[PDB]
């Protein structure tokens, strides 16, 4: 809840966001409180407007404050626009994932602006593909989804792809078995394993649990 | 001497304004006299044509002693000066004078009434290229202007010889008067500064002095826009022999003649010395200039 | 949709990341930014060491209100022992501050005046050690196969630019291999 | 799929003869063509043509591009071999063919070839002559990305 | 020779990528070839008309032979192929416009009307999201991180001219100003040096 | 001493630093990974570096070449570790007063030689005691030779050393020969010299270019009056991505056809159909490599038969100046220009020298005086433009060679303008099959138009005097900035595009050839 | 048409209710200057402000 750590986690989650190939839980519990706090300080400009009134000095933190405001605002702009982009590419499969019962639905936890842009964009998109090519819509071809073969609208839940990762985790003072460091896992091959000081690139799937656990940096 | 570091000592004198009238470079008589100066210097003609960078070290170190031992014959004894030289290290030193000439050259090249104003707009457009040119690190653009300065000085001295053959000067007692009504490469003459230095190049040439009574020169040119004929004032240059507070004359005379009927006259030029006038009306303007002469 | 990189971070973006680094300074003065994380502090005594984030120091240096202390780790003799350790370690990429590249680029822009003769001295050293590090990356890079990649110690900048290559290749290897089953 | 390479990959014609009689030649006015007629056919159609039966509809004759002369030739000196004339889509194509046929040996072969190609392609990447022209599509795209990465990096050093 | 029109169009798309590569991004898509699309439609229409014809005749003279089902299975794939080409084509065709909708908004005529319809609804939709944040975003621009804080910009054919104060835009006059107002004027191309 | 110079240049590459950037170490770090095995140094930057170094290079070049080769290879070994077989590099830089000195110059290439080879590193052997040493060499232009002692003592004497050929190393050698410039001082016969090339400079320029060569004017002795032939060793030959950006910009403007017809002959007013056909000649059509046993032809042909005074001569000269490779010939009778060469003589060997169509394979051939020409080797020209296949079945050789040329004609009918007042044929006395084997036939007429006459008058006076047409600089600011620009553009244009016609346009030509053949039926059968 | 209302608001500010200022910002929003928007806005009871801000054939 500390602004220092909030900002730390802000840049943290931004990096995590941009590195991750596919969607992550929406942090409204945090995103909201920050969007409000920034609007508070943002309005808080008032001392600058009241400063012209004293005329019938040190503006350094003033513009520094303003600077960091817009600066952090940049960070969040990239963050949100990036999420939007990812959704645009994953839109068919994410809605199909919404159709399925298990595990976690799209909704708001994992995903408000997003869902609106998602459904609306997909809507007009369907109007754009529909009015153009599907008119001219053969009976079997009427469906826009996996037939199967080959395939479509199933892409791209690939967790197997390699990506850079960095071992970092909360210290006991658990899974640290020694001698140097933690932890122990491919399906067809064994553990390598890991050390907190060096990045080991491997399959994004095996480390997914750790990203949910926040046990490995990206 | 001009364009010292980036050009041949030969071309340096060849295009030298100071050396010009004293040696009468336009005429053939002083040509051999110039080679005679090199014969005193013991320098091969081919050695003079090489770039300053590749000339031998001996020729470098001995240059000033040779100058001291030769140039005095032609009365050039007062030349050597202790002027400052910048050290930017690795790309080589340049005297402030040369960089000045190159930057001003960059100002003049390297770029009904709507066309003239459009061209005026283009002159202001060339200013920012110069303001940008003031930095040390941006050398790429600077070398272009450095070389174009040579292209100008070439055209200056060329047209100069052309003027020397026809002798269009009216050696009057009141003031000398001239006009260039036609000639090749008149586009370069649009800039007042072209004619400023051009006039200066003439003023020292026609009168060294060359006693007596230094006199002002008149100059003008026009191509289109209905006889614009920019006429800029010009003043004599003494060869070190401000002896008197003379300064200028023309501002009062321009006020007297512009106070008359002043038909088609345009004082649009920011500098008081230059004015646009119709040739039809320039002739009486001259008549009124001769008399009543304010000087 | 910026599209760039999109996988890599832009160099200027990683510069934006390194902005977060705290550093010691020597202010000319002898505040209470409400924004986010500084929270500190009372007016500092002149020529006294105080830790502050990088970009604010850049500001104060632009107004020349602070005297930046040079980082103690950056000393030519230390880079000499690093290069020594490098000639004897064909595999290990040992010590790097990890952000040092961009630092040195920035410190030589302005902070250059405080250091004692860095000119034509450490600049060569950092370059020399840089390139020998790059090639040692290449020597370990020829060994590349799934599933392990030795990431050991490197400055984040070079890791970022080399990212598209290895990242896009290894996927092909894994795919063809596992797929063959 | 939506990747340009997919339709591009399935576009190449493969000479695989069918096991049965085929009325309605899609390529002539027989009308039915007798069984075992070898004809080049696009990977997309021919890929699953024999998948349906349980006897397959197509013999799936071995590719000429995958000839032992080709495969050992590539096993010899990868740096000089020119993939651009023969296919030119090779890794992205061979993976599809090898999925259909499911052989483990040549996969293990081609992978090393790709590794050395990578080595070499990254060596030209730092900043030719004629080799730079023969590279397959995927490696070309990666080369563009790598080039801008380093150009911009050194440019990022100064201005 | 058969799915050939698809090859030409997919190829044109492929070239259009490289046409857009550096480029500078001046990308003005040449045209929508609907004539070739018509040819696709004529071939599919003929194909499925014969297909439905044999599908009806299957109860009388074909007698549902096993080999007869193959041609249906063939044309179905071919249909998907055609579809696939147009889908991907349009998806990229759409994508590039979408990019052009983002970058310069900001803050043609030759292309097919359906695109402009989608475009106008897309831009209206993105303005709806701009209305939602109220953050502020300003999400379509401000791509480069700021520093530090002031910059010197020169006018690009703008005179002109206002936000917070009227600065009296004057042609060919360079200033020294903070990034803020510059960000708005650069969207109109009115400023040149950065 | 010896190593101090090596230390000075290692202290040059490693310890030079201009404002925020070091340049030469980056040059070498780029070149090794590229597999260059070479290095380029701007001598003007070297003069910019120090003063004593340059005069030292100025005094003895033959002695200071190896310190560069050593400084090249010692830095190259650190990056070589960073990169087995690695030789020493070669640096490439760019009369009584000229013996063996650093002089740059310029000329034209007369004739090259065949890639030859000297040796670089070599080991010898004593054939009796089995004593082996090894010597590496660089300056192959006399100084040292093989000794005549077993050297184990330091009697097998005299020279027992046998060159081990299985464990030697070699480089390549070129040996050009250069010819003086045809514009200045031939007030004579052309003179020539002898060149000699080193490692990476080999096989670089096909002869005909106008080039500059930096060199060393040294002296050798081979074939009591001290007659020695002099020569110039070649160091740094220089020849004749962003441009692609402006190329694509120039490709799509719909006014390109006209702006190119504002680029060919600014000195010549009128004759716009000719002025247009030159545009199409400098580009070259398609090239078909069919299953058919032959391939077809791409370049085109230009004729200018007509009345004298037209200055079609000036036009054909400027055609030669625009294309990168082309042969201009003025008539059948020269002072010195030939056309399959037959050379019979030293060593009593027959060898093939050259000619003219051989230089212009894939270029432009200009033939003036089409009717002033003999029938002595005309047959080679009657075939070179149609099947591209020159056969030789003489005493020396029996080959079939290639000739990808394009011929440009400029004739004169008999009696000038009266040839069109009689029957419209009556021009070539032999037959019309040569013209049928050409492409374009133009007839230049001469009709009085007083306004056209005054315009052609004052247009040409303005060309001579007062540089009125010569305004071109603002035109450069607005159209066709250079001729050399047009040349670089044609080089880029020929090998990149792969043109072919379009299927919807083919039926138009099929319906048009019918109309032309019908046109000939109308003028022929009724007449 | 593209505009930024946060930039627009302090200009409009030179008390005024948010509803009136926002309403006029929205309505005047279609009209745009280069900008000239300042010239039209300066030209402008609540009723008077509201009215002031507002400012089948044959071929
Ligand atoms: N516009 C022009 N028209 C014609 N001649 C010109 C023109 N400008 C300059 N000339 C000169 O006038 C000469 C006229 O002769 P040409 O035009 O060469 O006649 P010709 O028809 O070539 O006779 P040839 O060379 O034996 S076919 C040229 O060679 C030039 O020297």
Numbering used by the authors:
A (entry chain F): 54 to 97, 99 to 110, 121 to 175, 177 to 238, 248 to 258, 260 to 293
B (entry chain G): 326 to 436, 462 to 591, 597 to 650
C (entry chain D): 3 to 32, 50 to 200
D (entry chain E): 3 to 29, 33 to 58, 68 to 141, 162 to 193
E (entry chain C): 1 to 107, 120 to 173, 176 to 208
F (entry chain 5): 23 to 105, 130 to 140, 152 to 198, 203 to 215, 235 to 267, 269 to 304, 320 to 336, 351 to 449, ...
G (entry chain B): 10 to 23, 32 to 51, 57 to 66, 80 to 90, 170 to 173
Article passage:
Hetero-tetrameric Pol epsilon plays a key role in replisome maturation and origin activation. Pol2 is the catalytic subunit, with the N-terminal half containing DNA synthesis/exonuclease functions. The C-terminal half of Pol2 (C-Pol2) has been predicted to contain a second polymerase fold, which has become inactivated during evolution, and is followed by a zinc-finger appendix. Notably, the catalytic domain of Pol epsilon is dispensable for viability (though cells are sick), while the non-catalytic C-Pol2 is essential.
To understand the function of the essential C-Pol2 and Dpb2 modules during replisome progression, we determined the structure of Pol epsilon associated with a fork-engaged CMG complex. We added a slowly hydrolysable nucleotide analog (ATPγS) to stabilize DNA binding by the MCM motor. Three-dimensional reconstruction based on 78,556 particles yielded a structure with an average resolution of 4.9 Å and local resolution estimation revealed marked variations, ranging from 4.5 Å in the ATPase core of MCM to 7.5 Å on the Pol2 surface. Whereas docking of yeast CMG required fitting of individual subdomains of the N-terminal and ATPase tiers as independent rigid bodies, deltacat could be docked into unoccupied density as one rigid body, resulting in an unambiguous fit. Here, the double helix enters the MCM pore through the N-terminal tier, and single-stranded DNA (the leading-strand template) is captured by a set of ATPase pore loops (Mcm6-2-5-3). Concomitantly, the nucleotide occupancy state in the ATP hydrolysis centers changes, with density peaks compatible with ATPγS detected in the Mcm5-3 and Mcm2–5 ATPase sites, while all other sites appeared nucleotide-free. Close inspection of the ATPase structure in ATPγS-CMG-Pol epsilon-DNA indicates that polymerase association indeed alters the configuration of MCM active sites, causing compaction of the Mcm3-5-2 subunits (with the highest local resolution in the cryo-EM map centered around Mcm5) and relaxation of the neighboring ATPase interfaces. In fact, inspection of the CMG contacts reveals that N-terminal Dpb2 engages C-terminal Psf1, in agreement with biochemical studies on Pol epsilon replisome incorporation by the Labib group. A second contact point involves the C-terminal winged helix (WH) appendix of Mcm5, which is clamped between the inactive polymerase and zinc-finger modules of Pol2. For example, Pol2 keeps the Mcm2-5 ATPase gate shut, with the dead polymerase module touching Mcm5 and the zinc-finger appendix touching Mcm2.
